[PDB]
């Protein structure tokens, strides 16, 4: 549920605050959807499903993950590579917007307004560097990827 996305956001903040080169997440399709969007937006370096121990650092892309079955699904985890440029984490802040207590949904015209830096609904306008990820019927997208495809949906979190 949305609680896992909320844990994924606070965990990545703590892993970047600690300047960790790697970090693990519970293996769920929802966490994978947000991680693929962060990687697609350029905030993380890699995504790899593995066990409770991180794969070999050097051979990370050519890593061969074993098939996921009911005999090991309980130990699978998503390993994320974190970026740090100019003595600063590239994924500094991950502020959630929709929470377990309330799921915030935005319309296409509200996202068009938030994309240019104007408040709309419970959201606020985006500034230089900030990003916004929306969970739509076309997958987890960035607010500028959503307005291009002309869809709304559930707002997940704002990435500074």
């Amino acid at each position: 549920g949305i609680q896992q996305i909320t844990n994924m956001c606070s965990h990545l903040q703590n892993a970047s605050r600690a300047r960790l080169g790697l970090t693990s997440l519970p293996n769920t399709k929802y966490n994978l959807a947000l991680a693929l969007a962060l990687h697609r937006a350029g905030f993380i370096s890699s995504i790899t499903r593995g066990g409770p121990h991180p794969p070999t650092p050097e051979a990370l892309m050519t890593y061969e993950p074993e098939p996921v079955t009911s005999a090991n699904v309980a130990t699978r985890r998503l390993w994320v590579g974190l970026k740090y440029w100019n003595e600063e984490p590239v994924l500094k802040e991950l502020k959630p917007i929709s929470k377990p207590s309330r799921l915030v949904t935005a319309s296409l015209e509200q996202l068009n307004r938030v994309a240019r830096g104007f408040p709309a609904g419970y959201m606020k306008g985006l500034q230089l560097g900030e990003c916004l990820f929306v969970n739509t019927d076309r997958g987890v997208l960035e607010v500028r990827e959503a307005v291009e495809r002309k869809v709304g949906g559930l707002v997940l979190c704002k990435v500074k």
């Binding site: 399709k29 994978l32 693929l36 990687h39 697609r40 995504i47 790899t48 499903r49 892309m61 993950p65 098939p67 996921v68 079955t69 009911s70 005999a71 699904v73 998503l78 076309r138 291009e148 495809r149 002309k150 869809v151």
Partner: protein
């Protein structure tokens, strides 16, 4: 017209410059979400019975 234009965009192909520049994510991780039953679930259950006994 408003419907066709909106439906066309939601099902449009990604930009070429976005394809030839984005790093690779192995499909083994980006698309293998289904978790089937262990094919060896019966053999393991029969061996676990012997060891537990």
């Amino acid at each position: 017209a408003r419907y066709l234009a909106n439906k066309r965009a939601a099902q449009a192909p990604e930009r070429l410059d976005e394809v030839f520049t984005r790093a690779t994510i192995r499909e083994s991780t980006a698309k293998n979400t289904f978790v089937p039953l262990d094919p060896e679930a019966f053999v393991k259950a029969e061996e676990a019975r012997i060891k537990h006994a």
